[PDB]
Design a protein around this ligand. Structure first.
Ligand SMILES: NC(=O)C1=CN([C@@H]2O[C@H](COP(=O)(O)OP(=O)(O)OC[C@H]3O[C@@H](n4cnc5c(N)ncnc54)[C@H](OP(=O)(O)O)[C@@H]3O)[C@@H](O)[C@H]2O)C=CC1
Ligand SMILES: NC(=O)C1=CN([C@@H]2O[C@H](COP(=O)(O)OP(=O)(O)OC[C@H]3O[C@@H](n4cnc5c(N)ncnc54)[C@H](OP(=O)(O)O)[C@@H]3O)[C@@H](O)[C@H]2O)C=CC1
Ligand SMILES: Cc1nc(N)nc(N)c1OCCCOc1cc(Cl)c(Cl)cc1Cl
Ligand SMILES: Cc1nc(N)nc(N)c1OCCCOc1cc(Cl)c(Cl)cc1Cl
Lengths: 538, 529
């Protein structure tokens, strides 16, 4: 029995990102050591992240009474002993202690302990224990009645507790912003500690953050029976391939909505072939939800560029169907569907190369108008859906008819291809806008991460020009499939741990949906793993 | 008394041949016929029975050995009547892995061996259970065994299989006093041997690592509603396991009632609403016709047959006493739609028109539209038979161009189909869902449609997946939904189609039969007049 398990000694910290160099930091690398800034100038690097404070307080103050008698027995056995409100103990480097504002001290409902050489009990007015050696802390825990013991930091205090192998778990807040720092959390050794849980992502005081838990690596109840009774009733891909993924206990990060779908398709999907030969695995009907008020959901388990998909979005809004516009901005999302061959194979022998036909943009601005060619002038022809939904959101917000629909049955065969994203339904409550997008056909490997981002942005754009705040983006998948030759790559991705999401900012001067331009969009604090080739062949 | 020795009954009860029929828990009471079981094989019940009576947990025994002695290879005790035993096929006797026990008089240990037990009277088993080292004790019954054991109040849990079909029977399970026992769990619904069934669990009433368990609390540090009370949902909350598919609809009602946003609507009524729910029903296992209130299906089938005809004439339905579209077809309703030049009950280019003629120009409800617009319905049928893995098998009612001409825009946006291994699944997207009156009907409708489409395409139905956009409960529906929430569902009915019908246009009202619909009594959602 080691000292850490017996005495239930844990660390808890909060780390931001810190100011590196600008010599090629458009394309920089990220890892766990990305978040490492602990202090600056004897205080915290940031003003107030109240949600972290709330977390910190709740963890360090939470005790479970019933669980104690069994810890009150474990510790006693270790020290050779037989067997008013239970409190946790918290330990602080002296400098850490000085940094805390007076009105917070001693930390309420906790047994305060302070590490110091240069100071002694006489230097303190407060109900606190002073100790001058780590060893004395162990001696003290021996004597006291407590639930858990949390090391509250000091990088010095952190360093010495890790290297003595005293920390059973690190409760770690990732603060997804950059600040000046002079003090840093020790680099965690991946062989000594592994992440086992990952929380939801939140925003607090203008930054996203999540909370992760590292664990030390070792290298009534009648109704519990009823559960077994009621449980009395394909692809054998290999366990080990999901070592990391399957080791996590809590996968609460929103990116897991995506990743669990992949997992599900890999384990349970249906083997099917296209009329061609390319094999997929597929399943029918999934849903993901995303809280746009808390983060922007750009996947972090691989790198995504957003310029293209933003250009495509602006191109939809202008009602364009001319692929050349996109190619001239070096965006090739639609190149393949615009070739002479692709159009001929679509029986559009009379369609000019890159004239995509009555697709999205056209349906959004001119539904029902007779498509001629990509250069025609369609103004006041067809139904301006975009305008009407913006008008409904503004003037009739309780409407259950706020739908934007790409799927024009009549023009389907004239489109280079039918829309993958069928429709958008909007919802308004309490000055907040939510949006369901229904997608009939979903390539999970490449399509889906881009599609989540596109419609997230669109919700922001619509909300803003209607003076509302974005709320939920809800993505419905009909035929959801993975390409067989993406399997190895998705395997890799599925074992990366997500990072806290970035945030999206829109120029606030833009007040009509038609008036956005590319430089009106900024992603801030995109932290992400390395880019992946989905087929390992190119 | 019973709490200590862990004595439970386990049964299976079908419905009995009875010359308005009322349903309650007593509806399921058929135990046996001619000294045999009323039904032939029901293989899933035999699997449940074997699994429950055999299963043991050794790491939970010490707690019970502690309990029993104080008061004074681990297996379970199984107890039956003589008649009961003399009907089990010998190739199953002795009951593999179970302390076999018989409660008889006429015979004793002078006939059969000592490894198998035989006992004298009711309170000659308790005595025999001190002597014994066993997990739990199951009364496999026989009518009188059950009877006398419930009589003496020696039963803690009844594990009760509801067989949702009717057979001739000579013996019945006794009435269970619902003041003495209550249901705390209800399972998923299943099809076995041409019948649906579920498994419920009765409980006697009380009427006088841990590392990660903490970590769970932390992740909850930030957790967060409406003027609905707790004690009104007594029965609903007092259930531990709610695996019956009907809870997919009821849980949504609960969620909107607890967490719904207050809104006043189109007319000024009051609704609670949320946005985005999903439900899934396994059509190969049952027909999802709600059981916690009475539903009628003639009208909705006629609406569907009307849609398939491509009809937009509301008078066709009114002449059959299908009044679903009545209010939408009145002079006054259409004038308020700015449809001053539309004949009454001419609903415009709605569903039928869209499914058979999307894109054609609408004139009036009497015109001939033959070969005008796209026949979506014909097209999706061809895709299903000839290109089953297509991801474009969709039937879309929402014609943006025609919306304003419709009496009202479709509540039911679209249907997507999916085919794999001879089976057909369907997703229906619904933009606006009146959870109280509308959605129970909507579920039945597209379920039936999915059957119709599968059959004409030579496939088996698989899943109906209902996606809900704006999901709302009417405020004046609240009291009734509360009553409904505390009702326990019954096993679902089945839908039979006439197997002769092989083309989508050939169905008639007489080609549809609902079987074994067991249901609670009718509720009026608006409890006013
Ligand atoms: N964001 C976060 O999660 C956290 C941030 N912080 C920040 O970090 C900074 C402080 O970190 P740091 O400079 O490392 O200071 P520390 O809190 O680590 O304090 C170090 C001091 O504590 C005492 N001490 C440490 N180890 C021993 C030992 N075992 N025996 C006796 N005394 C010991 C000594 O006190 P003495 O000088 O009296 O001899 C030493 O100088 C501040 O900016 C603070 O705001 C702190 C905690 C958490
Ligand atoms: N569907 C289901 O869940 C089940 C159905 N069954 C069916 O039930 C039918 C049998 O029911 P039924 O005959 O009414 O009941 P039993 O099978 O329990 O048979 C009753 C017999 O048990 C003995 N017995 C009853 N009370 C006592 C007592 N106080 N002390 C000692 N012995 C007693 C008597 O046998 P003796 O002559 O020796 O005195 C009596 O004749 C069968 O057809 C069987 O298939 C059986 C179990 C479960
Ligand atoms: C803030 C924090 N957050 C996390 N997740 N872990 C910590 N150890 C931590 O530090 C706890 C000790 C410092 O406490 C404070 C410091 C300052 Cl500067 C202020 Cl203003 C308030 C408190 Cl409580
Ligand atoms: C089958 C069953 N299922 C449940 N759920 N409970 C029972 N008591 C039960 O009866 C078990 C005792 C009767 O057993 C049999 C009777 C006949 Cl007739 C045959 Cl063929 C086979 C068995 Cl096992």
């Amino acid at each position: 029995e080691q000292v850490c398990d017996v005495f239930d000694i844990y660390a808890i910290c909060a780390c931001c990102k810190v100011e590196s160099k600008n010599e090629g930091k458009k394309n920089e690398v990220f890892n766990n050591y990305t978040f490492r800034g602990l202090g600056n100038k004897g205080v915290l690097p940031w003003k107030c992240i109240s949600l972290d404070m709330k977390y910190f307080r709740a963890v360090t103050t939470y005790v479970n009474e019933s669980k104690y008698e069994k810890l009150k027995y474990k510790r006693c056995k270790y020290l050779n002993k037989e067997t008013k409100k239970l409190q946790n103990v918290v330990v602080m480097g002296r400098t850490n202690w000085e940094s805390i504002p007076k009105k917070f001290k001693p930390l309420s409902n906790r047994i305060n302990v302070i590490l110091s050489r240069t100071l002694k009990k006489e230097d303190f007015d407060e109900d606190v224990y002073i100790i001058n050696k780590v060893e004395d802390l162990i001696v003290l825990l021996g004597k006291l009645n407590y639930y858990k013991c949390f090391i509250l930091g000091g990088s010095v205090v952190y360093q010495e507790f890790l290297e003595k192998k005293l920390i059973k778990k690190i409760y770690f807040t990732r603060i997804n912003s950059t600040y000046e720092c002079d003090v840093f959390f020790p680099e965690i050794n991946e062989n000594e500690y592994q992440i086992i849980s990952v929380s939801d992502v939140y925003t607090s005081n203008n930054t996203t953050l999540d909370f992760i838990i590292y664990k030390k690596t070792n290298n009534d109840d009648e109704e519990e029976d009823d559960f077994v009774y009621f449980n009395f009733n394909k692809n054998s891909i290999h366990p080990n391939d999901f070592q990391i993924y399957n080791s996590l206990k809590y996968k609460y990060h929103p990116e897991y909505q995506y990743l669990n779908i992949i997992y599900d398709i890999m384990m349970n999907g249906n083997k099917q072939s296209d009329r061609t030969g390319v094999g997929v695995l597929s399943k029918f009907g999934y849903i993901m939800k995303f809280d746009l008020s808390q983060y922007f959901p750009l996947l972090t388990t691989k790198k995504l560029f957003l310029r293209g998909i933003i250009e495509e979005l602006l191109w939809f809004i202008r009602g364009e169907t001319n692929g050349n516009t996109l190619l001239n901005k070096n965006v090739r999302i639609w190149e393949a569907n615009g070739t002479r061959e692709f159009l001929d194979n679509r029986k559009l022998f009379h369609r000019e190369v890159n004239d995509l036909g009555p697709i999205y943009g056209f349906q959004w601005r001119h539904f029902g108008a007779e498509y001629t060619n990509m250069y025609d002038n369609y103004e006041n022809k067809g139904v301006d859906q975009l305008k009407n939904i913006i008008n409904l959101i503004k003037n009739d917000p309780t409407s259950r008819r706020i739908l934007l629909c790409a799927w024009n049955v009549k023009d389907l065969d004239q489109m280079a291809l039918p829309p993958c994203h069928i429709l958008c339904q909007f919802y308004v409550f309490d000055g907040k806008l939510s949006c369901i997008m229904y997608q009939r056909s979903c390539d999970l490997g490449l399509g889906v991460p881009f599609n989540i981002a596109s419609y997230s942005i669109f919700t922001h754009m619509i909300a803003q020009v209607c003076n509302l705040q974005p709320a939920q983006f809800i993505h419905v998948l009909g035929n959801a499939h993975v390409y067989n030759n993406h399997i190895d790559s998705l395997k890799i991705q599925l074992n990366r741990i997500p990072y806290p999401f970035p945030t999206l900012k829109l120029n606030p001067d833009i007040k009509n949906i038609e008036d956005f331009t590319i430089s009106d969009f900024t992603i801030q604090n995109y932290v992400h793993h390395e880019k992946i080739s989905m087929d390992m062949a190119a």
